[PDB]
Design a protein around this ligand. Structure first.
Ligand SMILES: Nc1ncnc2c1ncn2[C@@H]1O[C@H](COP(=O)(O)OP(=O)(O)OP(=O)(O)O)[C@@H](O)[C@H]1O
Ligand SMILES: Nc1ncnc2c1ncn2[C@@H]1O[C@H](COP(=O)(O)OP(=O)(O)OP(=O)(O)O)[C@@H](O)[C@H]1O
Lengths: 356, 357, 357, 356
């Protein structure tokens, strides 16, 4: 029996079979309804339907649309019979015991699954790097977290939720490409702007130092080819966009940037384990994808910590999917097997069995 | 007693129910479901609400953790114990040594393994992890061989980071301490401000270092320049050689950022670690411990004489400027000068651009 | 030694200067201002930087404070002591009694006043405040007369606020405890959810009160209605009289907001206060203490029998619904029902508007 | 010797002679300079000069313009010789010891004053109500504070600075009168909009309840007469403007409203004195002027505190000037006299004498 792994993202469902490679079913988590349709299809029929966003920010909010998600995941992309395969879904950090409890209930009652598990995404990401202790920076489409973890357990009041993430950075690149004269504010064709963000732009090691080079190097700026014939160019705004991570103030937030969030997260934690936290520090998810973000982070934390502090950033080449892979690893893990919840024991204890 | 029929599997209702021993004093024993049989018409209810119809000696968490670790390893329990015996002369992966160290068996779970090896035959009926742990506790002097291997893989990168901080304190501490073009500047200040501060308040032979910071503070009656500006003009005119004077002190910015107490106790810890290496290598390895200890002990010694002179140098400057090295770190001490230089530099730019325009 | 001339008054330079006993080990005794005499040209300096040329026995703060208080008073120390003697039968301003109470003299500053009245003649050479304090400590039983006056001015407004809380707990606690249309609703729930929850998990005779909150929680397979919606339709159909049922419980919202432990100990404190009043009035006032105590002691008694029955009533309901009054306040207990009513009410609005189309 | 009292406000200098009545010299604290002129004159010559705002928000920032202020205060409005009269200036709460120290230095060195004192404005306000203990809500033009005070001493880490105040409420009334169709966005003629705010509009006891009456009563709305011939009318936006106090979100702030600010200010304080803090609660300054604000406040705190809590709002009819009067009271106070700083002792100790 192949088990199943579903990572439910603020912008994206990343899902597929355990036995680690990658999720082969990855789609925008969106629910369209007549003024039901799920995924990229909803992007296509957009405006004829009103898209609702169940997993926006951290937590699954309205459950009905979520059901629509898991149905489409199972029955369409994944193309399986949920009755057959034990399923592992992920959850945001700080996710409340009732969120988790109604997840399990929808699993067993709606999809008829044999067994299941709900696991904390940023612990899966720390698993995929071969670690049981450390601090993850999990940065997605809609949320960001700094999750301290010790002996597999994420330390509850350590976690710092930044409400800034990839969709917001896409918005910022809209704003600042417009200021450069480029013409797309359109909620349709902005689906190309994102692409720019993903293909070219990056994180400066020293911001102003690189924005001193604003016009100096012509090969500092890059050439972007639109899907159709026409082509355009991208200047300094390139590195200026992911900068918003470290300086949230760019979009107007009064929250700390990253390195801070990271830092006082570590600092919330017990004095002993602090060392191990700095040493093992794992960045995960598609907004941790910008080139050079690891080193910039590195220098910026080396700044906050003492002189003698061993500080390492672990930024895996495959980390866009970090959680999900840590999912596969965990599901396919053998000693994990006894920890699965089953219909037997849910029907025994009800949804509140989900606590371990 | 008396549960219901359930044609369709109704959703669990997660209510927290009362045990009948509590039920007695409450509203709940007044009347019962015995009236409610058909009544509400259970049928359209159930039509409306229907849903769709080896062994471990390690605590399971610890187990899972270990697994996640070794899975990343790729190494067998045998390769691994062979490596700890040979001191990772088979592929020394210090990271992995570090992760693994936490999983060293506690005596409590040495008990579950120990005679229960000889007793029965858990072998091959043992979970991979438990077997690993067995063979892992099999290694003699495990804890110390681990420690040693950690130490070894670390030492290079260690003084890689430790040395230049010791150097930057040493450099900066002395270049400051030994600068004449500084002592000069200071003495002009002592003058100027003593002139100001006299006729009332007295006259004084020197000032604590903080003072430097309020220089930009007290302006001209004109309000157009500052005191610092004035000291700048007075330098360029009456004492031109000093107009640079910052160029005689060097690592001060870098030395500011050094947390020295840490650096020293890191050096001391390194010492105890080398001692562990020699004690182990003694009785007895002896391969590749010797091959380390020789090519290292002199490097360590250089770090130690550089620690002693770093500490002495720094205490020297702090006391030299009036402050208490016991109560002040470089993270405070040196930025004073930094700010002053940076400002001085900033001052003459204005003193220059004012003369032009 | 050797301060400077200062033609014009240079701005103070606020530097923190070094005492010459510190000066010896530092850069600062190397060289001095003795080289710097003309040099920098002190003249254009000083032209550029020029500026423009009874008795208290109370600690002064306490004094200032008192003054600020009495200034607002308008009353003389004599008027005031007369008032405290007569129990503010001269203009009882409870506010002012309250402020004043803090300024009651400590024995420590009774010492400074006491014999130093008889000794010499500080009188009329004494600061107003000190004189006031003297005459203030002159009043016999000052502390208790103060307390009494506070108590008196407060008592009305006191049970003004205390009574209705006691009432609102009493009212609500019982209207809930005694409602049949409630016990009915609950028993329908017990049924329906036992039906759901049986065939597995068992069957149970009652549920802790939290349960009510997940009602809206578990929906229809349709997803279009909720359980609560269903219980609503089932009420309007099979049991129509219950469709109101909230109208049998009353002060529940208002009783939620009561913090009862406080209310009770406030009552007890009032008790001790009345006792002080009678103890004082006894030996001896006796004017206007009697004139209070009579017209009051029965009011107080009503508050006390209402406290006892409030407490007993509330403990009664809590235990009646399964919870622990020792561990739960109204601020938790009652909102459960509030939320359930508010929701139920909300539910039928939808159950109604759905039937319309 | 009449002493002097200068209250330096974020928008307004309220100054005059001790011996309490009211400041007779009150002018906008603004400094004009050629692209020097101080006060309402700067309002008149506006745009020909660039107005700088030394006291904007809490603290005096640029001192040169401040000197310009005190010079105009002394030499023009007040029409005195500063060498002659001991001067009492106010200061924001949390004002840093160097701000205070350079205030004193400018006093003695620039204006040649015989004696002086710097006092904390919100303590003066509490003085003018005859109290040494309590919590002031001092709400001015540019800042707002909740200042806990015990035995005359303001408790330092209690003080809560809200960056919202009267100028911001004037802006809000601009925004929401524009939404009603009225045509003045002008930075000139908006000096009438402020007037509306001051004469008519108020604070609702229950917001929505009163905005349910949005169009019901015609006498709920009021008639406003412009300076010239034309006249206009004011609707619900009337009570909607001071609401921004209690709901900062209206302008877009993530800061607590008032009652909250008040509350956790009290709650920052030691458990014993809490009682005395609730009991004596003094509102002060021209943004505490809106009618009914006291009772609204009252109900809103009675909400947060326990049942049995004695909670009184002191909102004096003269409190627009509260601080300044508390100033007169203090300067004219006799036991205050030994507390004055003098040139003798400044010239002895230098500006750091200002600490008591
Ligand atoms: N190379 C890249 N450069 C920049 N942004 C990227 C890159 N790859 C992916 N992204 C962005 O990352 C965001 C999605 O990240 P991700 O899917 O990991 O988060 P999520 O699914 O919402 O939550 P989680 O991190 O828990 O999975 C999208 O906005 C996408 O544009
Ligand atoms: N009746 C009123 N209604 C509403 N606001 C008023 C009224 N009277 C004055 N104001 C407002 O008060 C503000 C100024 O108040 P005030 O000058 O007392 O505080 P400040 O200058 O900021 O400093 P401080 O807190 O020291 O007094 C102005 O913005 C004005 O709009």
């Amino acid at each position: 029996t192949t088990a199943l792994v579903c990572d439910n993202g603020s912008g994206l469902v990343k899902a597929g079979f355990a036995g680690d490679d990658a999720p082969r079913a990855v789609f925008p988590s969106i629910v369209g309804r007549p003024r039901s349709y799920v995924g990229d299809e909803a992007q296509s029929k957009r405006g004829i339907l009103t898209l609702k966003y169940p997993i926006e920010h951290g937590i699954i909010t309205n459950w009905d649309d979520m059901e629509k998600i898991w149905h489409h995941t199972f029955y369409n992309e994944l193309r399986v019979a949920p009755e057959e395969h034990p399923t592992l879904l992920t959850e945001a950090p700080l996710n409340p015991k009732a969120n988790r409890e109604k997840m399990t209930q929808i699993m067993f009652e709606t999809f008829n699954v044999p067994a299941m598990y709900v696991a904390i995404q940023a612990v899966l990401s720390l698993y995929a790097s071969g670690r049981t202790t450390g601090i993850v920076l999990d940065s997605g489409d809609g949320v960001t977290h700094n999750v301290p973890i010790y002996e597999g357990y994420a330390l509850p009041h350590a976690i710092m939720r930044l409400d800034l993430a990839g969709r917001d950075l896409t918005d910022y690149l809209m704003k600042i490409l417009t200021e450069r004269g480029y013409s797309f504010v359109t909620t349709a064709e902005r689906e190309i702007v994102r692409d720019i963000k993903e293909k070219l732009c990056y994180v400066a090691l020293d911001f102003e130092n690189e924005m001193a080079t604003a016009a100096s190097s012509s090969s500092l700026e890059k050439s972007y080819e639109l899907p159709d014939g026409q082509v355009i160019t991208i200047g300094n705004e390139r590195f200026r966009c992911p900068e918003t991570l470290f300086q949230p103030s760019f979009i107007g937030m009064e929250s700390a940037g990253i390195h801070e969030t990271t830092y006082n997260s570590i600092m919330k934690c017990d004095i002993d384990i602090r060392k191990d936290l700095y040493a093992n520090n794992v960045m995960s998810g598609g907004t941790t994808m910008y080139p050079g973000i690891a080193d910039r982070m590195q220098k910026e934390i080396t700044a906050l910590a003492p002189s003698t502090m061993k500080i390492k950033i672990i930024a895996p080449p495959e980390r866009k999917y970090s959680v999900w892979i840590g999912g596969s690893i965990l599901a396919s893990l053998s000693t994990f097997q006894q920890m699965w919840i089953t219909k037997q024991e849910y029907d025994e204890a009800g949804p509140s069995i989900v606590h371990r | 007693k008396k549960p219901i029929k359930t044609k369709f599997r109704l959703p669990v209702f997660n209510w927290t129910a009362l045990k009948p021993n509590q039920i007695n004093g409450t509203v709940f024993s007044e009347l019962d479901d015995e009236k409610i049989l058909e009544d509400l018409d259970l049928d359209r209810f159930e039509e409306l609400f229907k849903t769709k119809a080896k062994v471990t000696l390690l605590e399971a968490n610890r187990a899972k953790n270990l697994a996640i670790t070794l899975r990343k390893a790729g190494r067998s329990a045998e390769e691994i114990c062979r490596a700890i015996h040979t001191f990772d002369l088979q592929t020394l992966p210090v990271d992995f040594v570090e992760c693994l160290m936490r999983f060293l068996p506690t005596e409590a779970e040495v008990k579950l393994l120990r005679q229960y090896e000889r007793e029965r035959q858990p072998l091959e009926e043992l979970a991979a992890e438990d077997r690993f742990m067995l063979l892992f506790s099999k290694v003699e002097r495990l804890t110390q061989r681990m420690a040693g291997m950690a130490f070894l893989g670390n030492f290079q990168d260690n003084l890689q980071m430790l040395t230049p901080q010791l150097n930057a304190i040493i450099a900066a501490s002395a270049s400051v301490k030994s600068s004449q073009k500084l002592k000069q500047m200071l003495e002009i200040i002592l003058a100027l401000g003593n002139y100001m501060n006299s006729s009332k308040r007295g006259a004084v032979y020197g000032f604590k270092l903080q003072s430097l910071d309020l220089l930009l503070d007290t302006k001209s009656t004109d309000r157009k320049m500052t005191l610092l500006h004035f000291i700048a003009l007075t330098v360029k005119e009456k004492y031109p050689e000093l107009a640079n004077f910052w160029q005689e002190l060097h690592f001060v910015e870098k030395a500011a950022a050094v947390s020295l107490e840490n650096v020293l106790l890191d050096v001391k810890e390194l010492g105890r670690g080398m001692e562990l290496i020699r004690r182990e290598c003694s009785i007895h390895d002896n391969s590749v411990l010797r091959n380390f200890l020789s090519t290292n002990e002199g490097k360590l010694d250089k770090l130690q004489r550089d620690a002693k002179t770093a500490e002495e140098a720094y205490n020297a400057v702090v006391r030299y400027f009036g402050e208490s090295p016991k109560t002040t770190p470089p993270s405070v001490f040196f930025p004073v000068f930094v700010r002053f230089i940076r400002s001085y530099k900033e001052a003459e730019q204005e003193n220059e651009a004012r003369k032009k325009q």
